[PDB]
């Protein structure tokens, strides 16, 4: 998320065995990184 010129990153990792879908359950994401970058953002893309 991008707020007041800060780009904030949260994340978590979990073991799974369900290939098909997101698992039905709960676990929260911790803050990892916070970038004071000031960019106006409207679009994004992902690296393979």
């Amino acid at each position: 998320k991008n707020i007041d010129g800060y780009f904030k990153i949260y994340s978590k990792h979990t073991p799974i065995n369900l290939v098909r879908d997101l698992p039905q359950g709960f676990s929260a994401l911790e803050p990892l990184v916070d970038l004071p970058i000031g960019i106006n953002i409207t679009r994004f893309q992902t690296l393979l």
């Binding site: 007041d4 010129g5 000031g38 106006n40």
Partner: peptide, 24 residues
């Protein structure tokens, strides 16, 4: 502070046009 003793010449190298947003 005033920088008339540093940045004046006049000097045209300084230019102008929001909350921590640049205007490139």
């Amino acid at each position: 502070w005033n920088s008339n003793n540093l940045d004046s010449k006049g000097n045209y190298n300084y230019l102008y046009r929001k909350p921590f947003e640049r205007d490139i």
